[PDB]
């Protein structure tokens, strides 16, 4: 409501600061500004900022049942929209080279940044560097002397690393651990013995929940300085499993969502990713059904995809992610209840951070 | 040499470190500790390590003449090491994606980090990534309790910025700027209007002298407590000065040092890349001259390349380099004076990066 009218307001201000700094610091030229300023608009604009918002909401929530001077309570919530843009520009820079890592085509309802007719590629790696690096430097400026400045950054850096980590564990979910060795040559794997709940969990776990979920909420406590006033341990463990779910609802409609509605086009069964639909396929596949998968996954050929996507349909696959969101209802629910212990409010956060995730349709 | 493998011991001390928490922390395969040890192996070992030696060199200088506890020794050169390793790896995480930006295929006598057999472009650019990550892992790590922490990780972030904004001057450095437009293809310029030495200047001031001179210098300073007996306009002016010489020298051995030397093969031509050649042979060549040059500059083909040589050749170009270098000469010896004035040991310290740079043949 007026919440995201607050966080839009300050984007244009990081932006103007960014750019302002680039002429007067950088000595950039008027359309290498345009170029940049294009380059953040695309990658950063038009999602649906859940985690941006997040951490203004997990403020909000702080301010709502306690009392404040205006001052105090400006400073706060313009921290948590720094802070937000911050996440939603580090998530830029994890797109941009997702996108050309996983050889996308679509972002966003446009192209893929790497696929903008005036866009390199090598270009493109860079930008997705400057994203980063971006955030850096509203960090350094907006919370030079902010109490929570030191946690804020050491928080950001561990999330950061967990998740290059977490792309890394992605990008090579399908090959045989055995045989990886940079010096050698190396197919994709032929037995998936490593398309396990427990391996799909880890990638997961890093790639995404820590980034999208851990950070966000965690953010909000810190520019709050209300991190003392919640059970941390919950909070953890609150981010892996909404995060996961997360995951898992993206593998899913990356098959089943149309690129008209979901904004990007499928990539996971072309690329032979461990995407959940193919750990639980093989999990309750026979012997026939899993020899047809091995025979058709992970091949840029369209009717080899369809073969994949047939096998999915008739195994149910749909009805198994109901029984997965049930399961994991009732742990949210049950963390919501544990975190209300404590605190009441950021309870209340977490449970609209949820309700946002489950409802998402994308 | 003794202070070599003494700075190497720390470079496997911190390679330990950052592997068994991968181990301990991040759920990491033996197999993916493997690829990570050989990739970080790969990326940031067998250079001239000039930036990482030269923080132990000032550090060192300054201990020379100042009255420290043993024990403040011991430290103060550890924090060297690791300083010294921060850039090491920032440099191995630029290098890596450059390779890949500028489409080579060799470096330090082995192929790119990209063109391994077993390794692929898309998760070379994410090993990219958790280099630059391993550096604020470092940080937080090795200096938790430092009261330089602050200083170095802003610094440190206003450096790689600074590079990523020169990578990107240099990676669209062959187009037109007034069609420099993402929405809009980009065709290679045709009459190198913008291959001027001001435009050249910009280019490596961001991409190479923050990150090669200036970081290293004051990074020394800082875990030696030592900022404060420096002018730090002076140090700024030889770092940008001595950069720039040292990436001339690298532009004139990318056309003439013979790969089995240099370690690398030259792509400048190739990549129509505004090197310091192209800027001076353009400055001085005639008509017909001009002509052949547009005719086969940046294009693949190894007839093309050998023209554009064979006209570098014939322009007399060694003879503007000994021109700018005797300059440069004069110039970094004045600066050398100057720091002598409130730093006699740092002056020293710029003396003996100077002569390194000066006499290097790769
Ligand atoms: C972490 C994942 C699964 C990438 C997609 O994130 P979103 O679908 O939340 O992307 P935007 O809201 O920023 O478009
Ligand atoms: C080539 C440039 C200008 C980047 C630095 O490379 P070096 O020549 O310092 O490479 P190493 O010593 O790290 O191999
Ligand atoms: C950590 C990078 C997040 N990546 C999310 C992507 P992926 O499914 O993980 O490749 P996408 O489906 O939005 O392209
Ligand atoms: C950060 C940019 C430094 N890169 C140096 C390279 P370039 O000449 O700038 O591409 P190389 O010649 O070593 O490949
Ligand atoms: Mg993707
Ligand atoms: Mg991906
Ligand atoms: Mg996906
Ligand atoms: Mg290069
Ligand atoms: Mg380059
Ligand atoms: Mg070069």
């Given at each position: ?13 990081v932006?103007?600061?960014?750019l302002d ?14 170029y ?27 301010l ?18 720094v802070?937000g ?16 890592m996983?050889?996308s085509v ?7 940044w790497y696929?903008?007719?005036?866009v ?23 919370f030079?002397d ?6 804020l ?17 992605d ?5 045989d651990?055995?045989?990886?060795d ?46 003392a006033?919640?059970?941390?341990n ?29 904004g990007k086009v499928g ?12 750990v ?5 596949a ?23 996507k ?22 949210v629910?049950?963390?919501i ?16 951070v949820?309700?946002?995730t ?5």
């Open positions: 409501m007026a919440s995201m009218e607050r966080f839009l307001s300050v984007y244009d201000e932006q103007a600061f960014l700094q680039l002429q007067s610091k950088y000595e950039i030229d008027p359309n290498r500004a345009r940049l300023r294009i380059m953040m608009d695309t990658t950063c604009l038009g999602g649906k900022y859940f985690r941006g918002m997040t951490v203004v909401n997990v403020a909000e929530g702080f709502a049942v306690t009392q404040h001077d205006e001052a105090t309570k400006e400073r706060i919530l313009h921290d948590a929209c802070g843009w911050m996440i939603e520009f580090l998530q830029a820079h994890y797109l941009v080279e997702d996108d050309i996983d050889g679509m972002r966003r309802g446009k192209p893929c696929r903008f007719p005036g390199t590629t090598q270009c493109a790696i860079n930008d997705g560097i400057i994203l980063k690096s971006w955030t850096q430097i509203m960090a350094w400026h907006y030079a902010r109490p929570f400045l030191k946690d950054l050491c928080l950001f850096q561990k999330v950061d690393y967990a998740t290059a980590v977490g792309q890394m564990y990008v090579t979910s399908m090959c651990s055995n045989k990886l940079p010096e050698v040559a190396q197919p994709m794997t032929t037995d998936f013995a490593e398309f396990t709940p427990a391996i799909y969990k880890r990638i997961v776990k890093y790639k995404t929940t820590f980034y999208t979920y851990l950070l966000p909420l965690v953010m909000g406590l810190f520019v709050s300085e209300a991190a006033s919640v059970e941390m919950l909070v953890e463990r609150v981010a892996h499993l909404i995060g996961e779910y997360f995951q898992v609802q993206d593998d899913v409609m990356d098959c089943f969502t149309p690129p008209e509605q979901l990539t996971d069964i072309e690329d032979a990713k461990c995407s959940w639909l193919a639980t396929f093989l999990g309750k026979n012997a026939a059904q899993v020899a047809e998968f091995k025979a058709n996954y992970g091949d840029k050929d369209p009717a080899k995809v369809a073969v994949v047939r096998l999915y349909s008739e195994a149910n696959l749909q009805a198994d992610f109901a029984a997965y969101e049930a399961e994991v209802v009732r742990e629910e049950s963390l209840e544990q975190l209300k212990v404590k605190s009441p409010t950021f309870a209340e956060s977490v449970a609209v949820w309700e946002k489950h409802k998402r349709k994308k």
